[PDB]
Design a binder for this molecule. Structure first.
Ligand SMILES: Nc1nc2c(ncn2[C@@H]2O[C@H](COP(=O)(O)OP(=O)(O)OP(=O)(O)O)[C@@H](O)[C@H]2O)c(=O)[nH]1
Ligand SMILES: Nc1nc2c(ncn2[C@@H]2O[C@H](COP(=O)(O)OP(=O)(O)OP(=O)(O)O)[C@@H](O)[C@H]2O)c(=O)[nH]1
Ligand SMILES: Nc1nc2c(ncn2[C@@H]2O[C@H](COP(=O)(O)OP(=O)(O)O)[C@@H](O)[C@H]2O)c(=O)[nH]1
Ligand SMILES: Nc1nc2c(ncn2[C@@H]2O[C@H](COP(=O)(O)OP(=O)(O)O)[C@@H](O)[C@H]2O)c(=O)[nH]1
Ligand SMILES: [Mg+2]
Ligand SMILES: [Mg+2]
Lengths: 429, 437, 429, 437
């Protein structure tokens, strides 16, 4: 019951999905071969949420792997957790999208989307009761953005009732691994804002600063960044998988997080994230974790929440803690940060608690903040988009793959409407 | 002979039901397997439990939740053998803290099965006195399905008593953003069908635990234990024999003056740690005085901000009628505690012989005396003013209305519920007026 | 010869009737099994007054046990004397009356009154000579008030000639066992005033005080209060049950006591009631008993006799007691307290003497007084009734069970008439 | 040769009858079984007793009471064998101190049986002197039933004598509130049908017992012993032989000057303790003077407040005619006492040889001389003035009239009784005034 169908598109989405499934199988006690060797019965009690029980006790993940180029999926299949997935779910084309949203959406999308949707349908019909979907993708990429938008639209067509989450590695202010990132990102959020129900915005620079300031990693590879993102995924999706004193499912998170249908862009976070040495000095308590997640430098998106205001806040705790102090620490947070919470929301916090902590830690907490400071990121992306679009620097690549410039202007107009909506409630009184 | 059907809706309702049936099993001596290993305890036992010819005893309980996780916790816990497997009703998907989802869409699928099980239990019941409902306003499953079930049970069994044990939304602390919406809508639907709803507050119980019990790490196990003690004190008159037996019909008749003013405030004394229990005497006068203090109320509402309009004291254990009589006369004479002039006799008294039982591993002290005080008072008009103000703040900008509209209800429902709660607050301030001429 | 049919309604009436039957069977030497083991032949001589002689020397009480809830009757049946009653007389309804006079009178009353009247009829035909009835009940309750009113009305309908006696527990100023005591009390007295011939008004606060002042009991439970009430009952009904030097049957008491058909509400009392320490110091004499019963502090109604004047007084004496020192002490009482006696009754005292004392005491006296101080109690109850009825505080519960507000107004009007009827003789000269 | 019938009505009548028949059995030597274990005693025995061929002797008695308890006490007492089992006639329910009940409603069932048994008793008499009646004005059974019985006997027998021994209501104390109503109604009915009724007062006898016999807490027994001594002195002339014999017809002729003034006052002497009997001689002059003191009257009425109009003295024992003649001349000569001028000879004398017999365990001292003084005098006018005032105070407000009206009589009867009593006291003050010439 309460199944979830996971999709991963793009190199970024595929790698984050690989680390996510590594973490999930690790904390459920499933070997890479798929045979369960875990100790707790609670791991098997809710294993149907993400896994299908194949014959002989082998647990197949309910995962769909997508990429228009086969290199990263071949790497995943060659990795230690290659055997865990079903071979049939590996769907790919023979040519990548480069970094062209047009190529990913229209040309290669029109070929591959049918196959991946029959795969998604085969997984969906197996569910006893299907809860919402999840997607991992990068807005800056071509393949991830285009295929993710196309799947989001068509899966909302086929399953309009279901919840539908996404985990987007949004572009960054300073670091940019692709020159056309503004175009790809703008078209991506233009498609996503109409269709999705929840989107959590990850920022690679923010992950780098978190690793440097808190974890003190001198050489943070993408493995550590994906480890943190997988930690956030396991934190948010814990209430379906484990018992808890306050259970908060994904639809509950949607109802608590989304005031208006288009403001569903969240800034996630996690605690504790201390280094090796700092664990001995720091006594981990619920006050310490609450102050850590509400510290701005801990946020996994580059935007400073102090620049904006919090519309809604959610905290999924994991481990064992008295909830009196969870509530009182949340109220001390609200009193100290009363300037940073919108008045028209009387209470912004959605608490949830789960009994079982992750990776043998005594405690953990996962933060989700719907705040108006994300308007700064959208302003930045729209400004870069307009700066390039004034000269139409790279529009011929997108026009060659079929689309019109009218689409680009429509996406810009919808971004302008989105930032106007975000600023309206900051200005409201 | 005389039966009460317990119903437990939502996570809060079922968890409190776990604690409550644990306490009832401990009091009546029933093992978690359902068998009694063992004279006056028999009828006391027959009120809440159904006999089977094999010697096993089945609770007269219906556990309902639209998500299966908590009821599966029940089905895996120590009391799995105790409950009827069929009565544990589980929906497929959660209400997502949405009153509209829990009331209309997901509610209409499962309401028929819930009513069928309630009908079968009532058919078995030789003499039914009423229903005991446990839920929370903030929860979607709780609020919406409790409203649906309450209207259906009013239509079917409207003659008999219906008693809700609802968790009021706390003033400062909260666990949900849409909690004022859920609470306003469910109070609007519940005001007509409810006979009397006893109020409970998590923040108040947290403060009670921290002050009196000296518990710096209070869990919802502790809170549900206290709520279990409250309901056991209420139902001990029906179960055990006593010098003065209070039934549900007279609870209703004494506590509820008007149809729409039926919200008493729960309270237990002595709440005290075993460490400090040795020093204090804990006589009838002391526990009676402790009941009326503002600090020991289970709702964060200062009674000094209002006037009492119906108090009901339920003494259990080694208790003397002269002692309780002198205590109530003293409390009447005090002027810090104020009563409405139009209710010259503001106290209902009940006594019974059975003292409370301390759960193993509990935080409360063993006491030969206990009292449960239930007060209908105008202080909670302030709390409804707070909740209505929060509802106004969110609904003025349509903060979360689109979810409820998607799950099948109009803005007319929101406006009508707000108007009804405004009428309720008016009625409260009206009856708070002192009589003239 | 000269039988009495006993009824006990409500929890209060049932418990007092249980203790009354303990006292009666104790002083008649009947075991809880119903077998006789007394020493005196006079016990068997008048045993037919209260008991029916079953086969094998077993004596069943002429009692009828009515209660709309089961708990008190089950407690009695499980008690030590539960064997003594006939099981058929345990008539009981399926749902309690709450504390609602309307529920007790109309809704359940129409159901159960048929069965209780069949039981009353079979007992009455079992009696060769039926003297009056005796009901025990509480005015403040729902069950006791409603069932008592309906039973009293129907028994007066079918048995108009025979006397009716009731022992009613009334509220006090400083206590309240139920919130709706004024409503239940007022409706009950309105129904009782035309039907009953005698009503003895017992008050819980007065017995509590008596236990504190005279008996010095630290923890007087309801058992001691019921002991005192049963003492008064055995005192008043002693003349039918034993030989006596000046007999006074209860028809004689009624004829002496009710000057006008509505003023039949009396004030009981008893002496001696000394504590364990005090009997050694005190010398039990008829002057001591007379001064004790005529003491205000001894009275079992909270109203002060000194506030009002006296109408008629009844002293039923028990034990080997002189019939001259009684008379001289009543003369001293009348001379000293002449200001407290109405002049238009020239002699207010009805003396009775019985040879057999109770409990092995050497001497005892039971006091009845028709003082006008009961107008204060009726004034108090009517004032509380009007205070609630001005706002119609609890009226919809009574209206749901069928009755109208006009009945409430009629009861208030009749209570006003009764208080005026008590005040006019105070004003008379 | 000459016979009397003793009818004992009400608790007072039957209890005094128990004492009386105890005294007669002691005087005649009859055992409580009824057998004579043993010359002049035989004819004296024959007057009050009916002899049977088996040697047993039955009293010429009819015991009537509408309540059964006192007659059952008689049926369990030592004299159960003495009385005829049928003649102890019992009704089913008490009169409740209600003249209306006893006269009209309850007495009408049993009056026929009582009259039939009185007829059967009268049939076995050669010459019936008359009837003796014992009752109390205050009692409901006594008042109502003696009124009904007196009118029925006056209708049936008529010319034969009819003597009552009634307990006059005491002046200060009273054991019944409705005593004035009962008393007024019964004497209203008694005035027409009676021949001579002898008043007795409980308070007066208490004062006598305290003052003379030197006892402190007397009881009815002693009172009934004194009343038994009175009737034994009255009837000893009929039973035993004597120097001057007197009959009931001559009692009427002497004591009754006018038909309605037939209420003398009982008195016995010497009432004296056994301890003080040694010091005093108790001669004829001493006892004769003791008769006429106000202190030793058995009705609380000072004779100095009125005038005698018919005195009748009954000496018994060692008495000579000259001693009594000198004493009566002395008492006539005294000025303290006063007699009506229109009765020059106010003394009737009777003497007989048999002295009184002291009962075992009694307080009266053994004496060879005794005297019983019966005095018709105007001092009872004061007592009836008091009783009329009491009746007026009660009846002005209709104090207890509804109880009498329920049992079938009108207020016109009350007014008629009061008018008759007004006429009686007018007659008393009329005869109390001296002649015009
Ligand atoms: N005292 C107490 N309160 C509880 C407990 N569990 C939940 N609550 C209260 O319930 C509120 C949240 O609503 P829930 O009752 O958990 O939700 P629900 O009724 O299951 O409905 P859904 O959320 O739609 O599943 C919180 O504010 C808690 O105060 C409990 O075990 N004890
Ligand atoms: N001397 C004397 N007086 C008695 C005796 N018994 C009763 N009395 C008087 O009778 C008065 C009351 O009337 P009762 O004779 O007792 O009544 P009753 O004749 O039995 O008629 P009821 O009213 O039916 O009982 C009291 O004031 C007593 O003084 C007795 O045994 N001896
Ligand atoms: N967190 C994370 N981000 C990645 C990873 N690999 C690539 N990215 C981000 O993804 C962006 C490239 O888009 P990508 O999805 O690879 O392009 P695509 O081939 O069209 O799907 C870059 O800006 C990277 O910051 C990874 O392993 N972890
Ligand atoms: N004296 C005495 N009074 C009692 C006892 N039990 C209850 N009462 C009184 O009865 C009143 C309650 O009314 P009750 O008859 O129990 O309500 P019911 O259930 O409707 O009949 C209270 O005011 C008590 O004072 C008892 O054992 N003795
Ligand atoms: Mg829930
Ligand atoms: Mg009598």
């Amino acid at each position: 019951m309460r199944e979830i169908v996971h999709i991963q598109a793009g190199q970024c989405g595929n790698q984050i999905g690989a680390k996510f499934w590594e973490v999930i199988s690790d904390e459920h006690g499933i070997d890479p071969t798929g045979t369960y060797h875990g100790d707790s019965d609670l791991q098997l009690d809710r294993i149907s949420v993400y896994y299908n029980e194949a014959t002989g006790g082998k647990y197949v993940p309910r995962a769909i792997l997508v990429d228009l180029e086969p290199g990263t999926m071949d790497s995943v299949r060659s990795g230690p957790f290659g055997q865990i997935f079903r071979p049939d779910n590996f769907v790919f084309g023979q040519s990548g999208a480069g970094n062209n949203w047009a190529k990913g959406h229209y040309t290669e999308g029109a070929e591959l989307v049918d196959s991946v949707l029959d795969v998604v349908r085969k997984e969906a019909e197996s569910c006893d009761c299907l809860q919402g979907f999840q997607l991992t993708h990068s807005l800056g990429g071509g393949t991830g953005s285009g295929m993710g938008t196309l799947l989001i639209s068509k899966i909302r067509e086929e399953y309009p009732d279901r919840i539908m989450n996404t985990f987007s590695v949004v572009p960054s202010p300073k670091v940019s691994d692709t020159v056309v990132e503004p175009y790809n990102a703008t078209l991506s959020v233009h498609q996503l804002v109409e269709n999705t129900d929840e989107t959590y915005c990850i920022d690679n620079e923010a992950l780098y600063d978190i690793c440097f300031r808190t974890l003190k990693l001198t050489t943070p590879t993408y493995g550590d960044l994906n480890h943190l993102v997988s930690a956030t995924m396991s934190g948010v999706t814990t209430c379906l998988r484990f018992p808890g004193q306050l259970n908060a499912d994904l639809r509950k998170l949607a109802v608590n997080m989304v005031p208006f249908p288009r403001l569903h862009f969240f800034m996630p976070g996690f605690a504790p994230l201390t280094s090796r040495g700092s664990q001995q000095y720091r006594a981990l308590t619920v006050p310490e974790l609450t102050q850590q997640v509400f510290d701005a430098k801990n946020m996994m998106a580059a935007c400073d929440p102090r620049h904006g205001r919090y519309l809604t806040v959610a905290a999924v705790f994991r481990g064992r803690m008295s909830m009196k102090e969870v509530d009182e620490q949340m109220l001390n947070v609200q009193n100290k940060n009363s300037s940073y919470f919108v008045e028209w929301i009387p209470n912004n916090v959605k608490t949830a608690v789960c009994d079982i902590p992750p990776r043998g830690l005594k405690m953990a907490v996962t933060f989700i903040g719907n705040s108006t400071a994300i308007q700064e990121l959208f302003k930045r992306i729209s400004e870069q988009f307009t700066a390039m679009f004034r000269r139409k620097a790279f529009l011929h690549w997108y026009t060659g793959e079929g689309m019109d410039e009218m689409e680009f202007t429509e996406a810009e107009s919808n971004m302008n409407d989105l930032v106007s909506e975000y600023q309206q409630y900051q200005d409201a009184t | 002979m005389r039966e009460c059907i317990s119903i437990h809706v939502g996570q809060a309702g079922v968890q409190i039901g776990n604690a409550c049936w644990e306490l009832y099993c401990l009091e009546h001596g029933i093992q978690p397997d359902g068998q009694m290993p063992s004279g006056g305890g028999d009828d006391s036992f027959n009120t809440f439990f159904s006999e089977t010819g094999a010697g096993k005893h089945v609770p007269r309980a219906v556990f309902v939740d639209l998500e299966p996780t908590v009821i599966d916790e029940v089905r895996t816990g120590t009391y799995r053998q105790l409950f009827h497997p069929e009565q544990l009703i589980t929906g497929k998907e959660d209400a997502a803290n949405n009153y509209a989802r829990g009331h209309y869409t997901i509610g209409k699928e499962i309401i028929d099965l819930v009513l069928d099980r309630i009908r079968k239990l009532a058919d078995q019941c030789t003499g039914l006195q009423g229903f005991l409902v446990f839920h929370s306003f903030g929860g979607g499953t709780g609020s919406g399905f409790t409203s649906l079930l309450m209207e259906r049970l009013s239509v079917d069994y409207g003659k008999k008593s219906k008693l809700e044990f609802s968790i009021y939304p706390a003033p400062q602390v909260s666990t949900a953003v849409v909690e004022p919406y859920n609470s306003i809508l469910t109070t609007h639907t519940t005001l007509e069908h409810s006979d009397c709803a006893f109020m409970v507050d998590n923040e108040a119980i947290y403060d009670i635990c921290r002050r009196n019990l000296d518990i710096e790490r209070p869990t919802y196990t502790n809170l549900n234990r206290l709520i279990s003690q409250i309901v056991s004190s209420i139902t001990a008159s029906l179960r055990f024999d006593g010098a003065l037996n209070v039934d549900l019909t007279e609870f209703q008749t004494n506590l509820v003056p008007y149809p729409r003013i039926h919200f008493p405030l729960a309270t237990y004394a002595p709440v005290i740690s075993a460490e400090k229990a040795y020093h204090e005497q804990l006589s009838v006068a002391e526990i009676t005085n402790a009941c009326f203090e503002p600090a020991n109320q289970m709702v964060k509402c200062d009674p000094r901000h209002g006037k009492y309009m119906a108090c009901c004291l339920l003494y259990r254990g080694d208790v003397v009628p002269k002692d309780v009589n002198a205590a109530i006369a003293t409390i009447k004479t005090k002027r810090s505690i104020q009563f409405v002039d139009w209710c010259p006799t503001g106290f209902k008294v009940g006594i019974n012989y059975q003292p409370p039982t301390v759960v193993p591993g509990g935080d409360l002290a063993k006491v030969q005396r206990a009292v449960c005080m239930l007060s209908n008072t105008t202080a909670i008009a302030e709390a409804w003013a707070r909740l209505d103000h929060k509802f106004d703040l969110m609904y003025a900008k349509r903060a979360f209305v689109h979810w409820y509209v998607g799950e099948g209800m109009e803005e007319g429902e929101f406006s009508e519920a707000r108007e009804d709660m405004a009428a309720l607050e008016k009625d409260y301030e009206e009856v708070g007026v002192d009589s003239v001429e």
